[PDB]
Design a protein around this nucleic acid. Sequence first.
DNA 1: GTCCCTGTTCGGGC
Length: 44
Amino acid sequence: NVKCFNCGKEGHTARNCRAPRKKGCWKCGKEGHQMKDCTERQAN
DNA sequence: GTCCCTGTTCGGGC
Ligand SMILES: [Zn+2]
Ligand SMILES: [Zn+2]
């Protein structure tokens, strides 16, 4: 299993997901930066 | 793609 960032549902990933993906931060939510970039709750 | 499998956004990898 692998929790898809885009939709949440397991068994597949963000790229695989048959759904339009997110622009901004996946975890924190806020755009203008990715989850990678994020300075908010940056730890995991 | 049933699943793999993660920042850039589809494509081989099994
Ligand atoms: Zn998905
Ligand atoms: Zn963020």
